[PDB]
């Protein structure tokens, strides 16, 4: 019979053995394992998405995207295990290289030097450049999604909320609401909840930069509108111009109902941070998404000048187009598509 972890079957042998629990989520259960064929340590996620249309939709997206991406700062998929027939496929196992830690864990135990902050930010943005060049929005960047080895190599993982948004087509009104993790959620996810852009990822990165500078979240809202209050208590009330760029009448009126708050200077929040870092932080944590720095300009900022090298920063050969987005399909059809997409890894070992 198959190996078992905390009561859960983990049917990944004989290739992968010696399973150890790492964690679970809405995303499913993760274990470390040893790959006996390649003689390397791996992480394996067990997913059981097939009863829920939204879970299928997200599994197909994550798999399609990561199988097509090839970049040093994005975690690859090594293998995918599932049953040899569609009727028997209840579970899917995704295998990746095992990383030592993540940025969340690291910031619980360790004040980082400016050098490490600077180098981590470079790699986050280097990977994000590739991701945004493909027309993908990540939509869930946060410290626990940034995997690291102690060699200081960093990889972005967790593409479960990711999607394609082809810029030939206006997606206003058609994007999923309530994306990102609360503390890392851009204001326009609250105020333009169906019409936000890839700029939401730059915001998340700004939140991550702030956390690396101080070892605590910058906007720790306890709930949905309290998040926006935290944001506004640092940034101040938006300018008249910024308010006028908010098309949703209801959201702009909600803002106009709020009591005035003043901008708190970045150097009063971060008295010992490098000034270039704070300047870049400001540009990422800009309220108006149309004024927020974009990934290439962030990379080109003076804070990152010792790493910025557009000849060693790959972009996607073949950006995703609108074709790859019509995945709003019955969950049985999505299952068929997941089966097809994983077939390249069949057969698996006994």
């Amino acid at each position: 019979g198959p190996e078992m972890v905390r009561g859960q079957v983990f049917d990944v042998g004989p290739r992968y053995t010696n399973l150890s629990y790492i964690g679970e989520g809405a995303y499913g259960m993760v274990c470390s394992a040893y790959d006996n064929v390649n003689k390397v340590r791996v992480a394996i996620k067990k997913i059981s998405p097939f009863e829920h249309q939204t879970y299928c939709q997200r599994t197909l997206r994550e798999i399609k995207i990561l199988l097509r991406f090839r970049h040093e700062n994005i975690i690859g998929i090594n293998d995918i295990i599932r049953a040899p027939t569609i009727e028997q496929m209840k579970d899917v196992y995704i295998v990746q290289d095992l990383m030592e830690t993540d940025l969340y864990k690291l910031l619980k135990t360790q004040h980082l030097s400016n050098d490490h902050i600077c180098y981590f930010l470079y790699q986050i943005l280097r990977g994000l450049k590739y991701i945004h060049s493909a027309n993908v929005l990540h939509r869930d960047l946060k410290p626990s999604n940034l995997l690291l080895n102690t060699t200081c190599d960093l990889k972005i993982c967790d593409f479960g909320l990711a999607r394609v948004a082809d810029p030939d087509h206006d997606h206003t009104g058609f994007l999923t609401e309530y994306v990102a993790t609360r503390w890392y959620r851009a204001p326009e996810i609250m105020l333009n909840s169906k019409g936000y852009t890839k700029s939401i990822d730059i915001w998340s990165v700004g939140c991550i930069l702030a956390e690396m500078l101080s070892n605590r979240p910058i906007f720790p809202g306890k709930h949905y509108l309290d998040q926006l209050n935290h944001i506004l208590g640092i940034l101040g009330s938006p300018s008249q111009e910024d308010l006028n760029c908010i098309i949703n009448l209801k959201a702009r009126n909600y803002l106009l109902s709020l009591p005035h708050k003043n901008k708190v200077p970045w150097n009063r929040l971060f008295p010992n941070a490098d000034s270039k870092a704070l300047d870049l932080l400001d540009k990422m944590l800009t309220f108006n998404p149309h004024k927020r720095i974009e990934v290439e300009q962030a990379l080109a900022h003076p804070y990152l000048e010792q790493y910025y090298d557009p000849s060693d920063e790959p972009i996607a050969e073949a950006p995703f187009k609108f074709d790859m987005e019509l995945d709003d399909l019955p969950k049985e059809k999505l299952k068929e598509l997941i089966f097809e997409e994983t077939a390249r890894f069949q057969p698996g070992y006994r």
Binding site: L106, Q110, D115, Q123, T150, T151, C152, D153
Partner: peptide, 17 residues
């Protein structure tokens, strides 16, 4: 977690030579 090495010992840094 602990034991974060010098940036010098990064695959990305080391290639750049």
């Amino acid at each position: 977690t602990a034991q974060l090495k010098p940036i010098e010992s990064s695959i990305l840094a080391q290639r750049r030579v």
